Design a protein around this nucleic acid. Structure first.
Ligand SMILES: Nc1ncnc2c1ncn2[C@@H]1O[C@H](COP(=O)(O)OP(=O)(O)OP(=O)(O)O)[C@@H](O)[C@H]1O
Ligand SMILES: Nc1ncnc2c1ncn2[C@@H]1O[C@H](COP(=O)(O)OP(=O)(O)OP(=O)(O)O)[C@@H](O)[C@H]1O
Ligand SMILES: Nc1ncnc2c1ncn2[C@@H]1O[C@H](COP(=O)(O)OP(=O)(O)OP(=O)(O)O)[C@@H](O)[C@H]1O
Ligand SMILES: [Mg+2]
Ligand SMILES: [Mg+2]
Ligand SMILES: [Mg+2]
Lengths: 193, 398, 441, 401, 104
DNA sequence: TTTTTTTTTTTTTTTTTTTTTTTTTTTTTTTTT
DNA sequence: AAAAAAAAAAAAAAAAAAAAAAAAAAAAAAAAA
């Protein structure tokens, strides 16, 4: 259900400057979450609505590494759906690649950040500023992976950074609820001996 | 220069003096440009959009070549020079190669042409505060690029700071400063009332309600609504995009007794002071395990409660730092169940550090060696919620 | 209408003479003659020299070099037996980059259309091998190093040591010029580089310290010249372009003014500069900065206002541009805050006035603000997060600077004076009386 | 293709020549006497027999003649402050020995020279030595291997090679392998290598050289002491020769004012040339003592009084206020806030108004670019630290009188 | 040389009459200017004084700690005062400098 | 089928960036009063 | 409990090591004849 809501959010951004972002309020159990994002990527590769880059907190120690990881993820995602160097991956090459490929047909550029709490704060703020500066040039959608609460996103995003943010909050079902559902329907199911 | 000002004055009301000054300086390309213009203001003043529309209108109506930057993107200077020479020397393709500032200056020098064509160049470097964080020859060469490249170019710098923040240890060239002062209440009401036709047509898009809509949703009604909006919202912010984005939602709430069928300040004065409390949140319950809850309130008591008093309270400004031995000692003191020190407890300490509920003020290289110092980074209301859902009073142990 | 096109021509002429015209120099009768005779003795008699133009930033340092070179280069005895190598310390930020540029500009045998082959060490060996093989039979190289202290900051000053060593040796007759703004640049040299430098230094402190020279300069920068002087200047500029700034120069042969229009303009200019309000504005400018770049910036903003409805220059326009110059900018940033940031800044001012400029915090200033907001009857309904966002807006505008901890607990400093906040309290529009009364005590 | 040009450059097949003039140079018959004295007083015109350096010539010539005739090789270290005729004396000894070798009064020898300041790395020393035996430009590893095979393997008939190393302290680094290789090759019997090293600091082998490197450098040293005023007078008088373009007291004034500051010979030969160019303008055929005093005022410059005299009004008020703040608080490094308070005090005393702090930062940046004061970046306004780079008595001399 | 004698005499005086061995170049030059004012000698400016101190450092008598600015270089004497008094061999001058305590 | 040209990959060499050593300065701890 | 030394630690400059880029060289594929 939340997968369908996120896919409808990406498509409704495609049917349409600030960048559209989507805080996905997941639980504190991080290794359960990334596989969920993979499912979203598959649905976003179904309708050809976007192409998805995933930015882990280990790859984004600096702004240079974050932008290089972003451009390399988007270019290799297009290469795997259908090789640049490390220092060659820039936002100008992303703009030229998007003009050469998908201006004639628009694919959104969904940027998934699965561990929002574990990021460097200044790198994340400058990355949001970089992505918001290229609005109109490159259609960016920013999917977040906030684990604790919306107070964390409101605290780590300052005034000038959140001035360029049009977020819409989604909610995932809780981990005790998922535990009780698994216990009700699998571990007490009569069809296992 | 009159065509560009007369074309930009529809899009930007109450900016006639700024567009007049920018048309006096860099309006006509047949006249020479100053070496650098620096226009500055607050957030939401309209200095990215005004210089962007000015550069697009100058490129459309005249023979200039424009370039709009953002100095946050330029983590090295080669990125800035590649974007600049891509926009200023177009139709170049993948043959573009700029090694350093010298190659950029030589390749701009080659772009000069005859006098009868009256060409110009314009460079807008948005978020220019980052230019004084770069390689210490970017800003002095950008301020004299017209003298260096021998071109009819002007470098426009945009930031939220005055130019007195930019003076370095070697000195800078001259610059033409320009102030975009933020709007007062009347100018802000004029800006918010400029979109009356768009709001009216969007409202008529969404049938007795439409007939009673199109008879009085008129301009004076919208201006009285904007007066009631700015009577409460203007004290906390003067930022025009936030006022637009909240005024549209409060108009969607405001029209309910008019469409359903004085007399209107009360039914909106509820939601107006409901929405004033949620300004700067652009939005269109932390569950934890049991021992993670106890470790979190034990870390709160470790950071707050004055470690000399730990000799008395358990034995039976700023948040002070603590070691993980003190955290485990207070945890076993306040739990009163005496659980086993397994790997999951110290893993819970590490993943509460990882979830930014704790932090590392010191240590971080001797985490197992006893010299690492932590700090708690939550408030009292969350600790009281944890103590309520558990049943353990923290104010007794406070 | 004809009366508007002549004003467009006057405005274009004055703007192009202010921004461009890189070769016209005013003053410096002895220093220009020293530099000119030094370069001519290098080119003609084959002597090797080194020189150091010193002076403040804004005096005619580059203009003196451009005037000397534009007067020497069409001689066809300086122009044919001398090649000129311009280096800039802001662009040539390394000895490697400077050496590739020297190799390209001298048209050496390993250049091959602007792409030097070989490493940095091979390029240094080839350059010193070419300069050692020369003598009085070879062409004179004139190295002109601008931003010379940045060349002093390189590794081992190694390029400097080589450029001053060909000057002291029986080799090709080079001449080293160093144009820098510092006055103590010669204590940045190493003892060998200082020993090889011939210590002749030319100082270019501007000759407009007294105010009557400033008024004469403001008169000569706004006046329209005689047509015969226009033709002489166009002749010299076409002659120096017959043989770099000369691609886009002033070139005053395109502009021609009738004698009645020049007569009326010069009468209006002398009548305006004879007044007391225009001289008071020029007195304020001369009190601040006596350089010519500041005056040319003022006169550019003054000449850009010449719209065809108001053709004349008058003293109230000069007073308006002086009012634009003399004002404070952080005060005008303070008049653009909302009332919440203004009460935050008044709380910071109260904390600094009580505790004698101790560092503050978000919690201390929020407590001092919340004690006022409970009795204000206007700020009852502000949350903690809105005041935190107002504090962050004051922080990113650098009205609050860190001492370089959590964001609500990081220590800070007020980046204003008390007089700026006191003037903000008088200049603020629609300030409520509760805040204006809380600001007094 | 230019790759053939670089192939022939790295192999040394094409000589690096230079462009030539389209005009023939002047003849010595068309020159005046002052122009001839200006040409003889150039520092680049080194004489054949150097005055005042005869004992050093005897020392270096005895060492080099002994090391050549004994066919052994060794090492010497000469040192002294710049301008004292070290390289000129050493290369004069080399030229005299080569003249004696061309006339069969001496065994032949091959003379190589390197300069430590004409290299970008010390390892490139190996590229230059091998470029002076064969002429090929190779990598430094191949050059070091070929030099090692040349100096370790005995091969008759090997000739003596005299290696000059100018600026030895630029070849010294953390590891000291280039200087150890250059001082270890003479110690082998199969190498007929004589290494003469020239530097400035006298205590260089004990200061920054390791124990084995100063152990191999030796104890045969020579110190070129600075020139006294009699020696500078003899140098300049020998440069002028039989002319009477200079006075007998002008040369003595240059010698007394140069021998008291550095003892340099380049300083005296440049101040005499500047005096010649001053006397050329005043239409006098001789160089009197007033032209020498004018040249000594110009070349030995002190222009921090004229800079403060030529500052604006607010900049001179700022310069008074920094000195008043230094007097008031006692410490030398003053912040901008106390300086601005003293600015307000001094401007209220003088009756003139001052700019706001945003323009006082511009005045401070202008004074810090000219290095009359030492200031920080202006990003930390009201808390940036200001040192007074000029002395406090210089401001009170420049503004009172 | 004479200016190097007046530099070393001033450094010996400032090391005698003060327990602080942290002597900068500007603080040494300001005392040297008063010293040459009392001897009626035209003293060098800062730019030539720095080169004079470097030419004495080449002898090994001093050591210059280099900093970002030439006024803030730290001069450290590395000889005994008897060695400096013997190397100058100008007893009638250094006996007059050390008796001139008032210019410090 | 054999020879010469142009592409591709490997290896070497040079440049730039990151790490490491080294000197200086501060700074929290320890001894004496 | 404060004054003063003292050893440990941090900051910063400087030099070296390693990574990256660029050029030279050798091997391979495809055209010339
Ligand atoms: N006078 C005005 N009239 C109409 N619209 C305005 C005016 N001023 C600002 N705006 C609107 O505000 C929006 C955002 O402004 P903008 O992005 O230029 O702010 P900014 O000056 O760049 O601030 P920041 O640098 O903090 O982003 C623009 O889309 C613009 O349409
Ligand atoms: N003596 C002068 N004669 C003519 N114009 C002058 C003179 N002095 C300054 N100017 C004017 O001042 C402006 C800057 O002068 P110039 O470029 O010579 O200074 P600069 O020393 O090169 O500056 P910087 O050191 O910043 O490069 C020019 O527009 C020039 O017209
Ligand atoms: N005794 C002398 N007689 C004549 N001329 C001299 C004498 N000594 C020095 N000179 C002149 O002064 C210059 C000194 O240059 P030289 O290379 O000998 O100095 P150096 O001691 O090697 O300097 P550095 O140590 O900086 O390399 C020479 O060019 C020479 O013309
Ligand atoms: Mg903006
Ligand atoms: Mg210049
Ligand atoms: Mg020498």
């Amino acid at each position: 259900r939340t997968l369908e809501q996120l896919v409808d959010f990406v498509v409704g951004q495609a049917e349409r400057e600030v960048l559209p972002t989507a805080a996905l309020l997941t639980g504190i159990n991080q290794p359960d979450h990334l596989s969920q994002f993979t499912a979203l990527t598959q649905r976003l590769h179904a309708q050809r609505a976007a192409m998805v880059c995933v930015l882990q907190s280990r790859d984004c120690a600096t702004l240079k590494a974050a932008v290089e990881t972003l451009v390399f993820g988007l270019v290799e995602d297009n290469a795997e759906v259908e090789r640049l160097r490390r220092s060659q991956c820039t936002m100008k090459q992303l703009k030229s690649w998007y003009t050469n490929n998908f201006d004639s047909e628009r694919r959104q550029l969904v940027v998934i950040l699965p561990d929002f709490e574990c990021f460097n704060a200044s790198v994340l703020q400058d990355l949001i500023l970089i992505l918001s500066a290229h609005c109109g040039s490159l259609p960016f959608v920013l999917v977040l992976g906030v684990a604790t609460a919306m107070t964390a996103v409101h605290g780590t995003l300052p005034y000038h950074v959140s001035s360029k943010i049009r977020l819409r909050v989604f909610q995932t079902q809780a981990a005790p609820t998922g535990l009780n559902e698994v216990l009700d329907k699998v571990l007490l199911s009569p069809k296992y001996a | 220069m009159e065509a560009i000002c007369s074309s930009l004055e529809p899009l930007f009301p109450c900016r006639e003096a700024a567009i007049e000054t920018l048309g006096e300086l860099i309006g006509d390309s047949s006249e020479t440009y100053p070496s650098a213009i620096y226009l500055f203001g607050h957030s939401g003043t309209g200095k990215t959009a005004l210089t962007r529309a000015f550069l697009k209108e100058c490129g459309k109506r005249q023979n200039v070549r424009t370039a709009h930057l953002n100095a946050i993107e330029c983590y090295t200077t080669k990125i800035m020079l590649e974007i600049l020479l891509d926009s200023l020397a177009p139709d170049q393709g993948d043959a573009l190669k700029v090694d350093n500032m010298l190659d950029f200056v030589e390749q701009l020098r080659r772009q000069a042409a005859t006098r009868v064509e009256d060409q110009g160049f314009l460079i807008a470097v948005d978020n220019a505060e980052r230019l004084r964080d770069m390689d210490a020859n970017v800003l002095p060469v950008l301020l004299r690029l017209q003298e260096l490249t021998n071109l009819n170019l002007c470098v426009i710098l945009l930031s939220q700071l005055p130019f007195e923040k930019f003076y370095n240890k070697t000195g800078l060239s001259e610059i033409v400063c320009l102030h975009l002062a933020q709007y007062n209440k009347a100018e802000t009401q004029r800006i918010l009332g400029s979109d009356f036709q768009q709001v009216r047509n969007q409202l008529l898009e969404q049938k007795k309600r439409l007939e009673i809509c199109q008879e009085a949703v008129t301009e004076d009604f919208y201006n009285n609504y904007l007066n009631l909006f700015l009577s409460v919202f203007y004290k906390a912010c003067r930022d025009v995009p936030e006022l637009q984005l909240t005024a549209r939602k409060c108009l969607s709430t405001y029209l309910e007794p008019v469409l359903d069928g004085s007399r209107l300040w009360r039914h909106i004065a509820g939601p107006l002071r409901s929405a004033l409390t949620q300004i700067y949140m652009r939005i269109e319950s932390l569950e934890l395990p049991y021992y993670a809850k106890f470790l979190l309130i034990a870390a709160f008591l470790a950071s707050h409660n004055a470690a000399k008093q730990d000799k008395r309270l358990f034995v039976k400004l700023g948040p002070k730092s603590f070691s993980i031995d003190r955290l485990l000692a207070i945890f076993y003191a306040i739990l009163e169940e005496k659980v086993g020190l397994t790997c999951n407890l110290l893993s819970q300490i590490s993943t509460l550090v990882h979830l930014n509920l704790l932090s590392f003020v010191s240590g971080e290289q001797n985490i197992m060696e006893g010299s690492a110092r932590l700090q708690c980074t939550i408030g009292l209301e969350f600790v009281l919620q944890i103590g309520k859902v558990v049943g353990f009073n923290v104010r007794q142990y406070l | 209408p004809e009366a508007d096109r002549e004003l467009v021509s006057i405005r274009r002429f004055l703007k192009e003479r202010l921004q461009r015209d890189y070769t016209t120099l005013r003053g410096y009768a002895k220093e220009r003659s020293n530099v000119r005779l030094l370069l001519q003795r290098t080119a003609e008699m084959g002597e090797s020299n080194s020189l150091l133009l010193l002076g403040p930033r804004g005096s005619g340092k580059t203009t003196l070099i451009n005037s000397v070179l534009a007067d020497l280069l069409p001689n066809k005895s300086f122009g044919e037996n001398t090649l000129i190598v311009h280096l800039d310390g802001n662009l040539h930020t390394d000895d490697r980059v400077a050496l590739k540029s020297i190799t390209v500009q001298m048209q050496l045998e390993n250049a091959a259309d602007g792409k030097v082959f070989g490493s940095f060490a091979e390029n240094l060996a080839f350059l010193l091998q070419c300069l050692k093989a020369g003598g009085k039979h070879s062409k004179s190289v004139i190295f002109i190093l601008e931003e010379f202290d940045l060349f002093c900051a390189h590794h081992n000053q190694t390029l400097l040591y080589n450029l001053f060593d060909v000057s002291q040796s029986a080799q090709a007759p080079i001449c080293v010029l160093g144009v820098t703004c510092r006055l103590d640049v010669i204590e940045l040299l190493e003892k060998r580089v200082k020993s090889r430098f011939s210590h002749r230094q030319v100082f270019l402190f501007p000759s407009l310290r007294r105010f009557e020279d400033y008024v004469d300069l403001c008169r000569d920068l706004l006046s329209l010249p005689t047509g015969n002087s226009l033709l002489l200047a166009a002749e010299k500029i076409y002659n120096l372009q017959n043989i770099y700034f000369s691609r886009n120069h002033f070139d005053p042969g395109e502009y021609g003014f009738s004698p009645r229009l020049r007569d009326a303009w010069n009468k209006q200019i002398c009548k305006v500069l004879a007044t007391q309000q225009a001289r008071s504005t020029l007195q304020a400018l001369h009190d601040f900065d006596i350089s010519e770049a500041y005056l040319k910036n003022f006169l550019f903003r003054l000449v850009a206002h010449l719209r065809p409805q108001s053709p004349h220059i008058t003293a109230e326009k000069m007073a308006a541009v002086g009012s634009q110059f003399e004002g404070d900018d952080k005060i005008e940033l303070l008049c653009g805050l909302s009332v919440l940031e203004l009460c935050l800044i008044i709380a910071i001012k109260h904390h600094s006035q009580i505790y004698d400029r101790d560092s503050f915090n978000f919690e201390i200033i929020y407590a001092r603000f919340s004690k006022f907001a409970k009795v204000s009857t206007t700020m009852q309904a502000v949350e903690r997060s809105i005041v935190l966002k107002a504090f962050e807006h004051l922080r990113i505008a650098e009205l609050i600077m860190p001492l370089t901890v959590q964001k609500e607990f990081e220590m800070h400093k007020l980046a204003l004076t008390y007089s700026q906040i006191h003037h903000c309290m008088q200049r603020y529009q629609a300030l409520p009386t509760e805040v204006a009364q809380w600001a007094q005590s | 293709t230019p790759s053939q040009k670089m192939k022939k450059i790295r192999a040394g097949e094409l000589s690096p020549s230079m462009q030539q003039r389209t005009d023939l140079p002047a003849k010595d018959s068309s020159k005046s006497e002052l122009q001839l004295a200006r040409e003889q007083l150039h520092v680049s015109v080194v004489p054949k027999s150097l005055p005042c350096r005869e004992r050093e010539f005897e020392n270096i010539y005895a060492f080099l003649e002994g090391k050549i005739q004994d066919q052994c090789g060794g090492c010497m270290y000469v040192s002294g402050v710049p301008g004292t005729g070290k390289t000129a004396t050493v290369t004069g000894v080399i030229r005299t020995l080569q003249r004696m070798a061309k006339q069969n009064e001496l065994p032949a020898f091959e003379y190589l020279e390197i300069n430590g300041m004409r290299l970008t790395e010390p390892r490139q020393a190996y590229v230059q030595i091998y470029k002076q035996l064969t002429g090929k430009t190779v990598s430094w590893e191949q050059a070091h291997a070929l030099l090692e095979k040349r100096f370790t393997t005995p091969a008759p008939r090997r000739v003596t090679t005299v290696l000059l190393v100018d600026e030895l302290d630029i070849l010294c680094n953390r590891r000291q392998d280039v200087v150890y290789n250059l001082l270890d090759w003479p110690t082998k019997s199969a190498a007929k290598l004589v290494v003469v090293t020239i530097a400035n600091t006298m205590d260089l082998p004990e200061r920054l050289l390791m124990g084995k490197v100063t152990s191999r450098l030796g104890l045969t040293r020579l110190t070129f002491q600075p020139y006294s005023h009699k020696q500078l007078q003899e140098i300049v008088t020998a440069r002028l020769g039989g002319s009477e373009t200079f006075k007998g007291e002008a040369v003595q004034l240059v010698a007394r004012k140069v021998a008291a500051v550095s003892g340099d010979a380049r300083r005296a030969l440049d101040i005499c040339r500047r005096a010649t160019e001053i006397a050329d303008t005043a239409a006098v055929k001789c160089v009197t003592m007033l032209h020498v005093q004018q040249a000594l005022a110009e070349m030995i410059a002190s222009a921090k009084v004229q800079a403060i005299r030529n500052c604006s009004r607010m900049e001179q008020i700022f310069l008074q206020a920094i000195a008043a703040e230094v007097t008031r608080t006692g410490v030398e490094e003053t912040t901008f806030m106390g300086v601005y308070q003293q600015v307000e005090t001094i401007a209220a005393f003088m009756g003139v108004t001052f700019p706001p702090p945003g323009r006082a930062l511009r005045l401070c940046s202008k004074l810090g670019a000219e290095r009359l004061i030492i200031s920080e970046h202006s990003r930390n306004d009201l808390f940036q630290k200001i040192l007074l780079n000029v002395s406090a008595d210089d401001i009170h001399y420049a503004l009172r009188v | 040389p004479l200016q190097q004698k007046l530099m070393l005499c001033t450094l010996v005086l400032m090391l005698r009459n003060e327990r602080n061995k942290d002597i900068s170049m500007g603080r040494l030059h300001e005392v040297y200017r008063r010293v040459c004012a009392k001897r009626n000698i035209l003293a060098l400016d800062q730019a030539e004084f720095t080169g004079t101190v470097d030419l004495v450092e080449t002898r090994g008598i001093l050591r210059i700690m280099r900093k970002k600015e030439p006024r803030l270089h730290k001069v450290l004497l590395q000889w005994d005062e008897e060695e400096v008094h013997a190397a100058l061999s100008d007893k009638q001058l250094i006996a007059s400098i050390l008796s001139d305590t008032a210019c410090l």
